[PDB]
């Protein structure tokens, strides 16, 4: 009877009729659900003069107070005759209007109506409230109307936990050669994972009858499956249900129309749901129909798109019912930089564990994972995925089917269909059920249909596992709070729109309005600066130092904001450059003003100088100052919360403030943005560049002798004369007997790598921690800090994107287990041969020993190691002692989307007693006739690919086609090398071709 007045807001959404409304979906402590409706207004901000003049009066208005309005138009000056920035003060009004309205000179137009709703009425989109029932009037069961939200929502109350309902889903469409088209191909499967308010999971998968034999259908029934003839007969406690395609589609329709909190897919918005919807419209007449919670608006499901070049398109469902249709694909692209956005890749990363072996032999390994085996509850997470997973991937390579599983709350025992190399321990990776679908569909039978069902339910459940892993629920709520937006808009809108809420709040708080009175000219800060290490291979340890949030702190330091910019002073020749510099310094001295040299904006200017006044904190610096403070708060709250549900909330809030802070740099460069400021953006880049160069100049050739650190240049502030002791010789608390020497080896936009002449990681960590302290106390200034992240032993690196090293972190000691770090690569287990592996391992082991001698040019190493290669290469080409085993390579057999490999295995099967069946793992080598000499052309090496079965013996009139293996090997070797012109000569001489260089 009585409504629970204690509610937690969980989404907000709009109808769009001619008679339109805002709706809240909330949840009570019991679990009841309350929809509340609010009238829609369009908000306008006007000056008090405009307000007084208004044609008919506005529906309503509230004063905002006096506010300054500042012209932020950027202008260049060829001298120091720079006019003051236009700035007026007036009383402002927020006005409300039920119909749209053109008001000739209204201000603050860039900000969103919804943002004004929350701000004006004092409502947090993720808040809990004791609603004042006095201000609600019922209109359906469960749906109330609220004319006065400010009063109705007046009692905010602390957050209480709530339960939520989820539908995760996946489909499977038939195909042979082309991508599935709705006009011809039927849906074969629809799988669903339902999570109830209780926490109960319900799995069910609907199989399409019409792609099976009547005999087969009856087999399925006899085996366990429910068969059904209409929607009416569906029983959701049956995990497997056979039915017609139309029934299947009507079931989808019934489920998709329900008001789940979240309907979650992987690429469902562009494919799965689009497919269901069109295939339904085809076979029956029917539409999927969404209604507002008061039944006033009804829309047909219709996928729309949103676009954003820097770049990608995203797809969105138009439901008007409060359900969040959430596509993990789009979200994962937005929120993570990854090599692949395929679901098998994303799952591999997310779900792995360490497997201690319990049995061996037959064709069945066995593993256990638990707290003992890897890390606390990392097995627990793997175990959850195993409930529905049917293929584990051992040690990065060996794909293999599960045979049995035992699962408890903390661990899993799992027996797999693989080969054998039984060490005590191995790495287990999850992901899909890998297959050849196209073949399965070609040979379709009952056992395949059941396999596909197992496959398809797992893809649905992968969405819930990823949703857990990526913490989307709490990120949505955190986003809603921070961005002052509906939960459903958080990951739909782009970064230039989500920043506007907290910006609007700050402008209100600082009683400030920023107005651009002119077309912005075009250009953004483009440049494409990418970063090349001084050398690739490292004999010695490398110390890693990160600036802390460099661009946020740069903006704070410089007070860089479009309205704190006094002007830009440009020059076309050195006479103007010099007069202007000396006038600059008289008229705009430090520390009140900072002056920043920027890449000049026109090809004929030789200098460009931005001058910022630091006396009154600018808008952008203050926004950033807020976001860092908020982040700090939540990081503390995170460490004082102890309930894991709380940990999740504060960890999300913290993360959300990182992200939005880091959005600001790019937004200063983006012309369609409320934070655009060409000068500020450029000045931010430029101040950051200098902080990297300064740190590097000081550390490059620095030495430590006695207790003293001799920095390589004086510790002078690069922007202006400073209070600080610039003396570069500095007392350290280290051992007097230590004597070491430092080299600035690599640095990028916010990071600096320092080589120390030492391999003793224990000492290297001692020293870096001290280097950290002295850098922060003596080298740096104001809000610039570094932290020392890690030591990198055996660094081999090519860029920040492609590198390999043993990482010993700050927490680490000499003798704990490293973290093998690999980045950007593509090899191992039969991309490359044992000959290559053995050669590269020797040429590294010999090259690192050649750098510990210290006796080198770039060339005395380069010549010495290209000599050694020639000899070893000509020797193997002559002696020929290395077994064929050392040149074998592997591959999986499968059907096409690949094309010449079907021809290869076909012709082997067609010509040999044995068959390589369509899921088998076969070996191969590059073999040619023995009367071919050293060949400097190449062909399609493909013609010399030769399957090597157990019988195979190398022809007396055949040779291992050594050239292919050498050319790949010397390619890897010249990219370890630093001298480039030597390397390109060797590679034309030996192989008649030009090498690759991973740039």
Author numbering: -3 to 306, 314 to 900, 904 to 1005
Question: What did the authors write?
Answer:
Poxviruses (members of the Poxviridae family) are large double-stranded DNA viruses that replicate exclusively in the cytoplasm of the infected cell. The enzyme is a member of the DNA polymerase family B15 possessing DNA polymerase and 3′−5′ proofreading exonuclease activities. E9 alone was shown to be distributive under physiological conditions (adding fewer than 10 nucleotides per binding event) unless bound to its heterodimeric cofactor D4/A2012. A20 links both enzymes, and the DNA-binding properties of D4 are believed to increase the association of E9 with the genome template thus rendering the polymerase processive.
